[PDB]
Amino acid sequence: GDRINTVRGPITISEAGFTLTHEHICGSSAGFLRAWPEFFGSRAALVEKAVRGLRRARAAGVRTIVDVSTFDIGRDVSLLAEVSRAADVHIVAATGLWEDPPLSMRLRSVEELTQFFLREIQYGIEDTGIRAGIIKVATNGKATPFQELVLRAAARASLATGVPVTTHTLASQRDGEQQAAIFESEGLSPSRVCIGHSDDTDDLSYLTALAARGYLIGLDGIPHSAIGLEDNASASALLGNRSWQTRALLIKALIDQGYMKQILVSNDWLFGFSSYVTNIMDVMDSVNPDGMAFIPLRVIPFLREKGVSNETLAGITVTNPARFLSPTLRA
Amino acid sequence: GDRINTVRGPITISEAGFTLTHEHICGSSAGFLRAWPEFFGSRAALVEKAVRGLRRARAAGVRTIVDVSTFDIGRDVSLLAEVSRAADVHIVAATGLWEDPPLSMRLRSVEELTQFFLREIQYGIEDTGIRAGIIKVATNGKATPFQELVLRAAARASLATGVPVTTHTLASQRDGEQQAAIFESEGLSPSRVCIGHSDDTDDLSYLTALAARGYLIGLDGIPHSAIGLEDNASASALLGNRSWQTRALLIKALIDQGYMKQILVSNDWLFGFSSYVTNIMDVMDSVNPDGMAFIPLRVIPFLREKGVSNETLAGITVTNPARFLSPTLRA
Ligand SMILES: CCC1(C)CCCCC1
Ligand SMILES: CCC1(C)CCCCC1
Ligand SMILES: [Zn+2]
Ligand SMILES: [Zn+2]
Ligand SMILES: [Zn+2]
Ligand SMILES: [Zn+2]
Ligand SMILES: [Zn+2]
Ligand SMILES: [Zn+2]
Ligand SMILES: [Zn+2]
Ligand SMILES: [Zn+2]
C-alpha cells in the first residue's frame, strides 16, 4: 500500500489521480482478438480507436482506468500496455473470472483457482510480467456452484495480497447479498470489495444494506441507456430503459445517506465489443459519443448543478479509488 | 488435391503415410496454456511428453496425425509445429468449433463463422501463417441453434476449399443423422465428412445408415475404456465401460459390410488435458501406456488375428486418410 500495479509497472497512490474504476479497452473472449482480429476491422484500428478515446478522456481530467477485463473477457495486457503508453493514461489490469469461463476453468477447484489468481497478481499475466491490480468476479442471479468457488478464490487471493475485489452483478436480483455472504465466510473485509453494476437498480434498501456493512458501491454504467433507440431489442436488453440521469442521481442518493467515501463511479465503456451482437459498439458510440470522458464531461457537471460540491466529487473520483486500489487487508 | 496443409507447410498425399485422423496434442481451452502453463507442470514438460509420445508412435509406423483441436479446445499451432519438427511426425491442424465456444463465437452468424473458418484454412491461424487442413465441429445430442450455424458454416467452408469436415457426436443420441441432414441441406458431399466418436455406440443400424449414404465413419476412440478402474466415476463417465476390443470389432463389422474404404481409425489421445477433471491425463495414461501408438501396436494385430488382411488394414490407415484429407469437392 505504497504502490498500485499497472500495465507499465508500479505507480504511487498520488500518480493514480482521477480514476475510472470499471472500464474495458475491449470486451471479448480469450484468444479471440489474436484469432480473428478482422472482427474489429484490424488490431491496429482497435488500438487507434482506444488511443483516441483515452486521449479525450485524459483531456477531460482522467489519469487512470481500471480495465476489469478478465481472462474470459479476452484481456490482452500487451494491448493494454500499448494503448496506455500511447495515450499517457495509466491502466490497472484485472485477474479473476467473469461470466464466460471455458471448461478448463469451470472444472477447477477453489485451491486451483486461488493459485491462478495469485499467479496473475504476484508473478505476471501470461509471459508478460504485467501484474493485475484488481480481481474481477461475476454472478448473474444466484451463483452457480463454480461461481461460488470463484468468489471464494477471489477472497483468498485478496487476503494473501491486499489487492481488492470488484464484482459483476445482475443488480435486479440483489446478487451483492450472496456475494457479500460468500466473501465474508472466507474472512474478507468488505472495504476490499466493490459491488458493481449497482446503478442498474433503484433499490435503496439493497444498496444501503451493502454500504452499511462496509462495501464499496460500483455506480459504473452511468451512460448505459437505450432511451430513444426506437425498436432495438438487443440494445435495450443490454443497456436498459433508465436514463443516465437516473443512474447518476444514485451517486447523489448515496452521498445524501452518508456514503460518499464508498461510492465508485465509472462508464463501463469499451472500444471493441465482440461478446455481444455484431455492431453493438456503433450503437453504443452513437448513444454516448464521449465514451470514457462521459463521467467528467457530463456526470460531474450534472451533479454540481444538483448541489454536490466539487470537493465531494473529487473525493469520489480521486480519493475513493486510491483508497480502494492501494493494497491492504483493511482499507 | 495435390497437397495437404500441415503445421510445417504443404505435403504431398504420399508423404502423409499411416495417418491417425482424430488426435490431440493438448485438449484445453483458448488462451489457457499461455495463461496457466503450470497447470501442465510447464509448457516445456508438455512439449517433451508430446515429443516422446509422437516418437513412439512414429517408431510403431505412424507418419501423420490430424490434431482436431479447434479454437475452443485451445489449439496452439506453434506448439503443434514445435512438437511436429522434434518428433518428425506431420501434424494437420483444424479449424471449426467444438462444444465450448465462448460468447464472441456463440453470438456470430453463419456468414461470420464461414469467414472465420475460411480465414484459418485459406490465410492462416492467428499471425502464424499455418493453415488448417480440416474443419472440426460438434454436437452432443440435438444441435443447439448455434451448433446448427457451425455445421452450416463448416459445410460452406468445405464447399469453397475442398477441405474435409470431421465431427464430434454423442453417438448414443445418433447425432450423425442430424449432422448429415444439415450438411446435406447446404449441398455438402458426404464423402467430405467423417462422423466421429462413432465407436462409442454398438448401433449398426445407425452406423450403416451413415455409411450407406457416403459418410466416413470415425472409429476414433479405440483405447477409451474405464473397464477395471474400480470406483472412478469421472473416468467412467468420460471413457465408458465398453472394452477396446468391442470398439475395435466395429472396424471388422464395417469391413464385413462392404465399407472398408469409409472407415477412419484413431485413438483420440492427448498429451495434456485441462478441460476435464484434474489428473485425468494420469488416469488415461495408466489405462493406455502406448498412447497414440495403441492403434498400430495393439489394434492392427488384434484385427489381423481376427482375420482382417494386412492389405485391408493398410487401406484403412493409409489410403482412406489420404483420400479424406486431399482437398476436393467429391472424393
Ligand atoms: C457533507 C456532505 C455535503 C454537504 C458536502 C458537499 C457535497 C454534497 C454533500
Ligand atoms: C474383400 C474384403 C476382405 C476379404 C479382404 C481382406 C480384409 C478382410 C476382408
Ligand atoms: Zn459486468
Ligand atoms: Zn462484516
Ligand atoms: Zn440494465
Ligand atoms: Zn464491465
Ligand atoms: Zn470429441
Ligand atoms: Zn446425399
Ligand atoms: Zn462412451
Ligand atoms: Zn477429440
XYZ file of C-alpha atoms and ligand atoms in Angstrom, chain A residues 22-24 68-69 73 98 136 168 197 220 224 267-270, ligand 6:
17
model
C -14.721 -0.123 -14.173
C -13.795 0.052 -17.864
C -12.639 -2.041 -20.782
C -11.739 -5.031 -15.382
C -11.412 -7.416 -18.289
C -13.269 -11.263 -21.376
C -16.343 -13.161 -15.410
C -12.916 -9.303 -11.076
C -20.375 -8.030 -11.845
C -23.347 -2.672 -11.737
C -20.268 2.037 -13.003
C -25.723 2.830 -20.384
C -18.800 4.337 -17.517
C -18.242 0.595 -18.152
C -17.232 1.619 -21.669
C -15.203 -0.202 -24.252
Zn -17.592 -4.246 -17.430
